[PDB]
Each structure stands twice: as structure tokens, then as C-alpha cells.
């Protein structure tokens, strides 16, 4: 679900 990478990619970024 590529679009959702964002979320997990916001945590430390």
C-alpha cells in the first residue's frame, strides 16, 4: 500500500 509508506516514513522523518 505504497501511499501508506508516508505515515511510517513520517515517524522518524
Amino acid at each position: 500500500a505504497r501511499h501508506y509508506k508516508n505515515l511510517i516514513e513520517r515517524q522518524r522523518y
Side-chain angles (χ1 to χ4, degrees):
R2 54 97 165 233
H3 291 300
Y4 250 51
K5 222 194 61 44
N6 283 294
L7 305 179
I8 306 301
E9 292 163 343
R10 170 174 286 123
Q11 303 189 211
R12 201 177 188 250
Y13 259 114

